[PDB]
Design a protein around this ligand. Sequence first.
Ligand SMILES: OC[C@H]1O[C@H](O[C@H]2[C@H](O)[C@@H](O)[C@@H](O)O[C@@H]2CO)[C@H](O)[C@@H](O)[C@@H]1O
Ligand SMILES: [Ca+2]
Ligand SMILES: [Ca+2]
Ligand SMILES: [Ca+2]
Length: 471
Amino acid sequence: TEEGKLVIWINGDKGYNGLAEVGKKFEKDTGIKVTVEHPDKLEEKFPQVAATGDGPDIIFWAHDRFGGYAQSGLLAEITPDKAFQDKLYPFTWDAVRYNGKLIAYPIAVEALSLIYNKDLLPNPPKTWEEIPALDKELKAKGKSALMFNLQEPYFTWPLIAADGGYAFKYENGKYDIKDVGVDNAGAKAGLTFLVDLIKNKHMNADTDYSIAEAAFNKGETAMTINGPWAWSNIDTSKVNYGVTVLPTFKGQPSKPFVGVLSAGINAASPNKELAKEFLENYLLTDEGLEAVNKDKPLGAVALKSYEEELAKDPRIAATMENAQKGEIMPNIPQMSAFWYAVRTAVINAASGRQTVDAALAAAQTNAAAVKVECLEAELVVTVSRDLFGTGKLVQPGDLTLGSEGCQPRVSVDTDVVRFNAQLHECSSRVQMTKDALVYSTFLLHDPRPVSGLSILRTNRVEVPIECRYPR
Ligand SMILES: OC[C@H]1O[C@H](O[C@H]2[C@H](O)[C@@H](O)[C@@H](O)O[C@@H]2CO)[C@H](O)[C@@H](O)[C@@H]1O
Ligand SMILES: [Ca+2]
Ligand SMILES: [Ca+2]
Ligand SMILES: [Ca+2]
């Protein structure tokens, strides 16, 4: 990558100019230059480049991605002394722990909250069920009740999880990677409510992060749903806003996934010592975290000393209230499959392209059995041969990707079938969102002709396979 310097990747919604200021100070004292970059899809790009021995020295992301990276051998083990570990909260260290090793430095606790315009709405609704009626009133005076990012499942998940949706079942000291709670009655109820909001034109299916942000920050919508990072732009807009508890659904609290912003060190980095110095002695200090937080708020920082200093903030208090009512994300490798599954399900259900029941049923299978990798002109689909959980392995001839024109290369291992497919010939459907070009197809399992009576538990499965590329 290059010795004698530090390249850092952090997401574009985070305080990367502030992190760059911390890097400027590092360079002053040490002479080592620090380059902070915020590439798009960095959570997907990191493992691709790190596997070739390249990529940045340090990668920032929520903790949920790091178990996959660790499992893939992409991360150096971090070795802080007890004195440094004492400075941060135990819960945050827990988040960056994988298979008995610490695999990242924890930075800050994140959770979504309800953000609301006090002038347009002095009393924000305590329940989701209120919102359609509240929207009607606001529509009368040229406004909307609620706008938030409907393109990323992170933002819709709190509602889905409220009445009993979950990611993976934690049982007997581990997560069961085949027990996915995206297709239970609680999850269906949550998504159905969301899809109804769109049906009844209280929300729009195409609404994304930037649209929702512009709407609230211009005073066009009374509420939005976002994290601490979002506050800086609202402050600049001079909108009179409050950060509060997310609305309940069917009397139960919204359950946002708690994320811990984490910093991992590339296993291929020749600057592992410099990276440790930077993170421990420059970033993870009151002065370091202040520089980043000033840029874009981090939330509840992992560093005890600075967290206590900011805890008075009622916005942070609300973040932690919502964090309390939600669940911490697993960091297991299967989380990206889970996120793909839910992202796709919500988009297809919200568009009316698929039903809520059918969408979430497919999401279960995708999360449990499927991995989608989108490359330049190419697509890789890896399917678990234990497709149902029976222990009975599917045969590759019974699996089909796309239509007859789609002629992928098919490879078989003991446990998986792998499709290497050209996107042009295998795209059943293509479409454009504001931000993306979307290529879509389907994976089918159909063991026809089957040799008996078909009793139950249909062996016919079909799941959406989809790739999204930035416009
Ligand atoms: O939507 C799926 C996405 O959710 C999380 O990403 C969050 C992130 O944790 C926040 O810090 C902020 O940047 O918003 C992101 C959602 O757009 C998961 O951490 C991520 O793995 C997952 O893809
Ligand atoms: Ca992104
Ligand atoms: Ca299930
Ligand atoms: Ca700022």
